[PDB]
Amino acid sequence: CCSEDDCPSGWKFFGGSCYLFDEGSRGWEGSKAFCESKDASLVTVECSKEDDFIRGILSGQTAKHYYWIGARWNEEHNDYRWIDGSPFTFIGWGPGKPDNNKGCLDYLNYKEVVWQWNDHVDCENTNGPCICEIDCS
Amino acid sequence: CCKCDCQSGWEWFGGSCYLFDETERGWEDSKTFCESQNAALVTVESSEEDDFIRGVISAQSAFHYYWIGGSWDAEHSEYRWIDGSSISFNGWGPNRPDADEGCMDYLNYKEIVWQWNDHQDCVNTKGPSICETDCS
Ligand SMILES: CC(=O)N[C@@H]1[C@@H](O)[C@H](O)[C@@H](CO)O[C@H]1O
Ligand SMILES: CC(=O)N[C@@H]1[C@@H](O)[C@H](O)[C@@H](CO)O[C@H]1O
Ligand SMILES: [Ca+2]
Ligand SMILES: [Ca+2]
Ligand SMILES: [Ca+2]
Ligand SMILES: [Ca+2]
Numbered sequence: 001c002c003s004e005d006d007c008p009s010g011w012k013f014f015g016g017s018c019y020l021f022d023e024g025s026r027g028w029e030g031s032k033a034f035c036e037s038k039d040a041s042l043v044t045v046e047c048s049k050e051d052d053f054i055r056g057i058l059s060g061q062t063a064k065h066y067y068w069i070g071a072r073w074n075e076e077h078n079d080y081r082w083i084d085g086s087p088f089t090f091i092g093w094g095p096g097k098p099d100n101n102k103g104c105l106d107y108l109n110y111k112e113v114v115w116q117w118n119d120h121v122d123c124e125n126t127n128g129p130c131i132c133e134i135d136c137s
Numbered sequence: 138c139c140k141c142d143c144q145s146g147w148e149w150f151g152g153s154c155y156l157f158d159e160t161e162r163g164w165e166d167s168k169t170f171c172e173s174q175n176a177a178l179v180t181v182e183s184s185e186e187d188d189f190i191r192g193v194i195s196a197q198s199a200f201h202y203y204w205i206g207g208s209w210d211a212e213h214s215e216y217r218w219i220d221g222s223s224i225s226f227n228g229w230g231p232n233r234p235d236a237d238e239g240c241m242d243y244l245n246y247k248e249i250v251w252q253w254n255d256h257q258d259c260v261n262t263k264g265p266s267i268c269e270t271d272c273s
Contacts, residue, residue, distance in 0.1 A: 001141040016141030046152060047139040047272075087185065089152030135140060 002136040011134070014053040019043065020132040021057055023064070028104035028123040031068040031130035032083065040132040042070030044082045047090050054131065055115040058107055068130035071105035072123060080105065080119065092117040107131070138272035150189040155179060156268040157193055159200065164240035164259040167204040167266035168219065178206030179269040180218035181253075187228045190267065191251045194243055204266040207241035208259065216241060216255065229253045243267075 001016030011018040026034055035042045045051050058067060070083040080098060081087045094108060094116030101121040106128065108118035120126055143154035154176075162170060171178045181187050194203055206219040216224055216234055230249030234241075239255030242264060246254075256262055 015139050047142070049139050086151070087183075137140070 002134060006134070006136055008134075012057065015047075015050055016135065017050070018134040018136075019054075019057075021067070021129070022132060023129045025127040026068070026130065027125055027127060028068050028072065028106075028120070030124075031128070032070070034130065035070075035132035038132055040134050042068060042083060043131040043133040044070045044084065044086065044135075045090055045092060051090060051092050054107060058109065058115045064129050065109045066106040066118070066120075066128050068128055069105050069107060069117070070133070071117070073102040073104075073119070094118055138270065142272055148193070151183075151186060153186075153269050153271050155190075155193075157203070157265065158268060159265040161263035161265060162204070163261050163263055164204050164208070164242075164256070167264070168206070170266065171206070171268035174268055174270075176268040176270040178204060178219055179267040180206045180220060180222065181226060181228055182222075183226050184228075187226065190243065194267075195245070195251050200265050201245045202242040202254070202256075202264045204240065204242050204264050205253070206269070207253070209238045209240075209255075211238075 002018050004013040007013045007018035011020050020038065032042055071080055072083065074081050094113030097113060097117060098119045101119055103119045103121040104123040105117050105119055107115055109115050138149060138152055138154045140149050143149045147154040147156050156174065168178055207216050208219060210217040218224065230244060230252030233253060234255035236255060236257055239257045240259040241253050242256055243251050244254035245251050
């Protein structure tokens with residue numbers, strides 16, 4: 001658990017985590033490496049307050065309609081879970097999701113999905129911004 | 138539970154806050170103590186949870202058993218978690234449960250290396266316990 005103290009310049013504090021809402025243009029796999037290069041991870045969302053926090057930030061802008069997060073299809077377990085291997089606790093799928101395409105998760109704002117989780121089939125060459133997290137664990 | 142929402146002395150794991158309380162109580166009084174903490178005795182739905190628990194209790198050597206939130210359900214004629222839910226994950230030690238109308242504990246003794254056992258004295262056998270809240 002971080003304090004506000006531990007958030008590097010330009011990172012937002014919430015719920016004992018530091019978040020970077022990065023506006024670059026990367027694939028999911030490129031976003032994963034980018035977060036690592038900042039000694040961080042693509043964000044993992046363990047509870048509804050963290051989901052509400054994220055939606056608050058993403059609803060503050062309209063340039064972008066998806067941000068990559070630290071979840072994808074796991075071949076070992078044949079399910080969607082976090083990139084650290086942790087199964088989902090909080091479930092954030094938007095209406096009608098997932099599409100079950102064995103892909104990578106973002107927060108999506110498109111038609112009936114109103115800043116909620118979606119799975120995209122292309123984890124390499126679909127470019128977007130991302131959310132990194134430092135949770136000091 | 139959010140990862141940083143566990144009150145003081147509690148540990149977060151897989152959406153739950155746990156308390157490993159070492160005051161020794163019989164199974165019923167342990168149930169009551171978890172209720173007083175606005176929680177319940179722990180229910181173990183997965184191998185992941187079981188391993189988290191084993192990692193904590195195999196770390197200490199004072200206690201050989203901890204009370205958890207499983208007991209005989211007459212209605213159903215089987216051990217159930219105290220919320221009424223079915224025991225899906227198989228965390229029993231070799232040849233357990235060996236009798237009905239018991240309560241469950243983690244047991245470190247002979248062939249049971251911190252797995253589930255059934256005890257048939259749910260009042261007067263005192264031990265530590267493990268509480269769980271999902272903060273709902
Ligand atoms: C990269 C991304 O999330 N793209 C999403 C796609 O997966 C989804 O099928 C569609 C409809 O929900 O919204 C897209 O345009
Ligand atoms: C309190 C407790 O769990 N005691 C256990 C008992 O239920 C079990 O039959 C025996 C054999 O495993 O080890 C005991 O002493
Ligand atoms: Ca998180
Ligand atoms: Ca999709
Ligand atoms: Ca549990
Ligand atoms: Ca027994």
